[PDB]
Write a protein that binds this ligand. Sequence first.
Ligand SMILES: NC(=O)c1ccc[n+]([C@@H]2O[C@H](COP(=O)([O-])OP(=O)(O)OC[C@H]3O[C@@H](n4cnc5c(N)ncnc54)[C@H](OP(=O)(O)O)[C@@H]3O)[C@@H](O)[C@H]2O)c1
Ligand SMILES: NC(=O)c1ccc[n+]([C@@H]2O[C@H](COP(=O)([O-])OP(=O)(O)OC[C@H]3O[C@@H](n4cnc5c(N)ncnc54)[C@H](OP(=O)(O)O)[C@@H]3O)[C@@H](O)[C@H]2O)c1
Ligand SMILES: NC(=O)c1ccc[n+]([C@@H]2O[C@H](COP(=O)([O-])OP(=O)(O)OC[C@H]3O[C@@H](n4cnc5c(N)ncnc54)[C@H](OP(=O)(O)O)[C@@H]3O)[C@@H](O)[C@H]2O)c1
Ligand SMILES: NC(=O)c1ccc[n+]([C@@H]2O[C@H](COP(=O)([O-])OP(=O)(O)OC[C@H]3O[C@@H](n4cnc5c(N)ncnc54)[C@H](OP(=O)(O)O)[C@@H]3O)[C@@H](O)[C@H]2O)c1
Lengths: 275, 274, 271, 275
Amino acid sequence: EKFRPEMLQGKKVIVTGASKGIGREIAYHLAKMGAHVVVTARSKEALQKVVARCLELGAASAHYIAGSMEDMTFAEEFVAEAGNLMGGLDMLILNHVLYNRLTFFHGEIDNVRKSMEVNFHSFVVLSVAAMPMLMQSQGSIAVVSSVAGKITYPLIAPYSASKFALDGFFSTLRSEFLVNKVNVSITLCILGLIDTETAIKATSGIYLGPASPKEECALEIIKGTALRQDEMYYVGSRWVPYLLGNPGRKIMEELSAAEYNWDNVLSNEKLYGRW
Amino acid sequence: NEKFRPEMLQGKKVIVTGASKGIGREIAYHLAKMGAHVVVTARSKEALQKVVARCLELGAASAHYIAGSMEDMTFAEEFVAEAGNLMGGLDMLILNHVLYNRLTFFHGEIDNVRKSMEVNFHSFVVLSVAAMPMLMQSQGSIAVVSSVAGKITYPLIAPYSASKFALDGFFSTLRSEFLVNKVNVSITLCILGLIDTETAIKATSGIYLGPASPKEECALEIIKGTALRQDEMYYVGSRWVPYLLGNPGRKIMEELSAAEYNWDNVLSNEKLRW
Amino acid sequence: EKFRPEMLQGKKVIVTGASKGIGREIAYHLAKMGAHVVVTARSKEALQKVVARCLELGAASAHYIAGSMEDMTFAEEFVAEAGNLMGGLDMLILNHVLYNRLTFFHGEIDNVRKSMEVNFHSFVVLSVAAMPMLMQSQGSIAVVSSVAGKITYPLIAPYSASKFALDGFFSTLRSEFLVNKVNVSITLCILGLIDTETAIKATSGIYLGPASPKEECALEIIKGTALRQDEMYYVGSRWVPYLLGNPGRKIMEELSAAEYNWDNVLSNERW
Amino acid sequence: EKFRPEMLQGKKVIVTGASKGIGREIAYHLAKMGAHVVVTARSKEALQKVVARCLELGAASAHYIAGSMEDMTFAEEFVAEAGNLMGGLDMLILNHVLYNRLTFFHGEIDNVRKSMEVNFHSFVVLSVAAMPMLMQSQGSIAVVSSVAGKITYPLIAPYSASKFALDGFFSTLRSEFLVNKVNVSITLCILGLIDTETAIKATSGIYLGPASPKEECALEIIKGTALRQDEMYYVGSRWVPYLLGNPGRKIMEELSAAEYNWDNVLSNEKLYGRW
Ligand SMILES: NC(=O)c1ccc[n+]([C@@H]2O[C@H](COP(=O)([O-])OP(=O)(O)OC[C@H]3O[C@@H](n4cnc5c(N)ncnc54)[C@H](OP(=O)(O)O)[C@@H]3O)[C@@H](O)[C@H]2O)c1
Ligand SMILES: NC(=O)c1ccc[n+]([C@@H]2O[C@H](COP(=O)([O-])OP(=O)(O)OC[C@H]3O[C@@H](n4cnc5c(N)ncnc54)[C@H](OP(=O)(O)O)[C@@H]3O)[C@@H](O)[C@H]2O)c1
Ligand SMILES: NC(=O)c1ccc[n+]([C@@H]2O[C@H](COP(=O)([O-])OP(=O)(O)OC[C@H]3O[C@@H](n4cnc5c(N)ncnc54)[C@H](OP(=O)(O)O)[C@@H]3O)[C@@H](O)[C@H]2O)c1
Ligand SMILES: NC(=O)c1ccc[n+]([C@@H]2O[C@H](COP(=O)([O-])OP(=O)(O)OC[C@H]3O[C@@H](n4cnc5c(N)ncnc54)[C@H](OP(=O)(O)O)[C@@H]3O)[C@@H](O)[C@H]2O)c1
């Protein structure tokens, strides 16, 4: 079941946080594959450059919409406008993340709140807004997370909380989609240190581990999502993913599914509605 | 290392949130039997009053209640101060309250996700920040009450699970920092299986066939594990399940990645609090 | 002597650099207190969002004027238009700034010039333009500065020069206003690391110390100015302000005032 | 480390604002010590007289270049021509200042701009232009400032702003030079009322303070700079310097140096470059 760049030709993709870093590279790859893209971020000028580059690169079409993901109204309206621009949606790539730095936690409650809004709540709002289109196209969602969304590291409590939250929410959603045979795939991407300008500045002489290249990172995210994988690990080691992937949890989730009165659940109107 | 004794809590100054019913109420009762000072909180005044009265009969050193919603961050903050005044300090902060939502498939209830994150997560953080000075002075402890659904995922409770995962991310990171900085406030994450509280029994009814553990013993185990300053406390109705939940891989990784830090540029830059 | 939010209800306030960071939060607080506000910065769309929010927050009125403070003609014209919009001016909050990712100095004269224009000269131009209105209302000026405006830090020479300049100028002006019994207060605000997106990005990986919250910072600036304080320290420590506040200088300034021949002076020499 | 006039024999020194007052006296002292000097100011005839006196006094060599420090192109070109004249540069004495008049501030924006250009920006331009030569010779810079550059006085806002600015800039530069082990010394000279014709006229019936002699002032500037001191106080009291010198600031600056990630900084890669 091998990946081929043709899996994305003509596809309608949204990439958030695409004015720089991994997101920008994700846009570029998609353009090379002849996909339709709508990129978003806060910076208009940066987004404009990305759109121009994507067109040169061979994108089927490329547009940008500028706004902050701290604003939930924008997140919601963005998905509608984007769907109009492309006439639908095959893939939703959730990549953006709030500015953060490395510091011991001292009581930055506002930082905790803002991180949860931008890194987490907006991912949920965007997904909800996109779900009708995704269900129609039987499309996919990439949820971009971090090694710090699977284990804990000093110096990034607010960030880690929001990335853990993503795992809890979207992993639960995936399980439901499976039980209800909804054919929208949800891929959780777990990234190690990636050599984006932002990550390198935040960590240079503090965290000493090696960084992985952003170009290959972005491609691996695209592949894993296209192939509809549950999780995609890009952490700079072929072994580390298994220490992160928690065999115990996968076993437990598989076994606990048998504890449900499915006879009832799948035939209970009150547990269902729609979007 | 050592064995728990009820005397570890005699005279101690403890806060129990979500203590008008269920596990929290039982936690209050145990603490009273051990002769601790308690301040219980929840939204229901009358229910809290009953709990305080019982705690006193039970042998609490002192018992008071403060009523309010944990969806209000100003209250959470002010509550900890008033509670500290009532007892003249704080040894143990037991974070127990929660917002439940009907077992139901998710389909766009964003407001439920937001409210769950406020009540189950953000307030836990606000309370902890407000209590930290007192806890540092007493070298006290925090119990963070969570769930099996905070370690693995279950259909039908996405909003709840997100908030409980968040707790693990945040408080586990905080603990690691406290260790690196030799701050002697312990943080105990409690992972509970199905417990036979009225609320949990009604909610899973005819949906989840799994077993329930007794609330009285659950509450005691939370108190013990926190008193003994354990990192985590599993009460899940099986002696084996905790190891399938406890993720040996993660513990190894966290231990090893600590060596990747330039601690001389981190700890030596530590010349600054709450 | 205690601050009350009512001190700002109906007041006519200008906030510069108010499209994000501390300035935006200053606008929001003022709106909650029912003040009239005119916000300014370069970004039109950002300013529009701020104005809309302020109105929802309970501002008596809110308008925006977009332009660069590197242009002195704009700075001057902005104050007039703003005064027209509100029919006067009670408080001028000078907050805007040019930041430079931290770097050792190595000959960037143009950076030194542009920093002095934006962080310093425009503060002066704006104050001069606003002075008639402020004298009429016996209003106040908040001059937003920095710990780097009181002591020196590696890596920010251009910024520090301009912030020191502000202290020199506005502190001298305050002393003159006192000698001449002009009742316009001048409050110099000295800020430590504040958790704005811009400050966090600029020092990330370089400084790992605690930043202070921007919401409380903005409120403290408003309070200190409303109470007409000479200086307002918000630096993340209750002790540090006294190591920055230079008791020696305050003593010297108090004593040297007696060295002046107030006869040949006060007898002699507007905007 | 006692000063000796021989520390300046054969040295290559620039003195700005040297057609009268303190600067002229600085030139004279340097000549007596057998240094090479290049003097500058706007007045040709006055500079010519100074050069002649310097030669008569025993200067190794003496030249003058006339021009205004309001013109940044001149400031830059002056340092090059001066370096050519002497074949290098050991000491840069920044002394010039715009004429100012004691008066309450009444919205004289043009005065503020011109004072900042002449008293501050030109000091920076000159320093930048001279830095290569100074680094080669491991030389020194004297930044001539004022008590009004450390505390504030009614009636001189424009002047004080520019002198404060000097402290901010050159004190920051010094700290950087120390961190990077660049061996060019920067001496900030803090002067009280000095009996130059200009200062006496300006303050005649206003400041009733006691003036210090200009000849000794100029010598103290030379000594302090030769001995590579951080600051040099000549204020007419042995006690006043400590009320101006701000112990609190020195402590803070010493302590805050420990808050930096030098391994990031010293190795942020691109925090350097050159002149
Ligand atoms: N880099 C790593 O080592 C690493 C490691 C683990 C996980 N990750 C994950 O990878 C993803 C991308 O990381 P990165 O290093 O590529 O990020 P980045 O370079 O720092 O930029 C992320 C993008 O998010 C956007 N963004 C920030 N705030 C926003 C807001 N409020 N509203 C809308 N967009 C906003 C930014 O655009 P604007 O500023 O213009 O708004 C930017 O385009 C993140 O989810 C991160 O957690 C990265
Ligand atoms: N029961 C289980 O099977 C189980 C399993 C895993 C984890 N847990 C954890 O155990 C803890 C207690 O569970 P439980 O079953 O004992 O809970 P419960 O019986 O449903 O009641 C929890 C308490 O929280 C309080 N509360 C709810 N909303 C509040 C608000 N907005 N502000 C302040 N207090 C509020 C309630 O008081 P008021 O309504 O009067 O405000 C109540 O006293 C929770 O953290 C839960 O996540 C339980
Ligand atoms: N943040 C800190 O840790 C800290 C510490 C000490 C002092 N301070 C002081 O606090 C004040 C605000 O800092 P901040 O971090 O909130 O700033 P910020 O987030 O970086 O933004 C400052 C504001 O100034 C505006 N601005 C920039 N260039 C301008 C120009 N040429 N003309 C007009 N407006 C311009 C910006 O709007 P546009 O870009 O849209 O023009 C922005 O709204 C500054 O005076 C700063 O020196 C902050
Ligand atoms: N005198 C005091 O009581 C006192 C107190 C504190 C600090 N200081 C500092 O001591 C230094 C010298 O003071 P001073 O009293 O000796 O000064 P001064 O007698 O008034 O003359 C200063 C020199 O600067 C030159 N100058 C003025 N404008 C210039 C321009 N646009 N371009 C180039 N050169 C210019 C003048 O020459 P031209 O006019 O021919 O150009 C003159 O040679 C100044 O930095 C001053 O701030 C003096």
